[PDB]
């Protein structure tokens, strides 16, 4: 069992803010949160409204998912009552950027995954790099938009198939087939899955020769989004063992949140 990355955010020593994006950035903070299931646990929070948040970290080791499972599993919370804001992550190959601080919204990524909320639109992104900066998308499931943590899980299997789960419950599965349309570079994934259908099937869409970095690059209107925990592994049993710990801690979190609301406004 090979764990390629497990960030619990005791600190963000590994994560480097971008110097290359040209955008107005805000600072991340390591915080407990307004409600939590473990008083010694902490998370990565966006601290300032109407700013971008752009940083990247190196994985524990460079790897390829050829002929292997890949599990991307992370716990994300919109504690602020989100009106418009991203909450997703990106995985990047070694050649995308010379070092962490070169990461920008335009850098080449292998995979973009996670929730994204704005103006009524609420989607879980699953974007797969196809060729160059062209990506594939399909019609996407809703994401959660309340104020407690939710575990997002993406499983990529080497028969070119995938599974999407929220809080340990399957919400979508399939093969990377003509359900998916091709997105042009820089074009928005609006969640409908409707773009350019004119591209040849790749039986190796699932596979990337290099995973080396992970990056966060989100716009925030109301800031306060918390990235609690990030796991990258090739081992389904290890992913399930860590999910159990996190889901039990999210249950205690929710009970603290319900007890606070029951006493307040
Ligand atoms: Ca944590």
Residue numbers in the entry: 14 to 206, 289 to 360
Article sentences:
Calreticulin (CRT) is a 46 kDa soluble multifunctional protein that was initially identified as an endoplasmic reticulum (ER) chaperone for monoglycosylated proteins and is also involved in Ca2+ regulation. Similar to its ER membrane homologue calnexin (CNX) ectodomain, CRT is composed of a globular domain, into which a flexible arm-like P (proline-rich) domain is inserted. The globular domain is made up of seven concave and six convex β-sheets forming a legume lectin fold. We have investigated the CRTs of two distinct parasites, Trypanosoma cruzi (TcCRT) and Entamoeba histolytica (EhCRT), for which a pathogenic role has been proposed.
E. histolytica is the causative agent of amoebiasis, a disease mainly characterized by dysentery that leads to about 100 000 deaths per year. During this process, EhCRT is exported from the ER to the phagolysosomal cupule, where it favours the phagocytosis process in a way similar to that described for human CRT on the surface of macrophages during the clearance of apoptotic cells. A similar EhCRT construct was then produced and beautiful crystals were obtained. The X-ray structures of the corresponding TcCRT and EhCRT constructs were solved using molecular replacement and refined to 2.45 and 2.15 Å resolution, respectively. A first example of a closed conformer is observed with EhCRT, and SAXS experiments conducted on TcCRT yielded new complementary insights into the dynamics of the flexible domains of CRT in solution. The first evidence is now provided of a complex conformational transition with the junction reoriented towards P-domain closure. Very intriguingly, a very reproducible electron density was observed within the GBS in the first EhCRT crystal form that was not related to the crystallization medium.
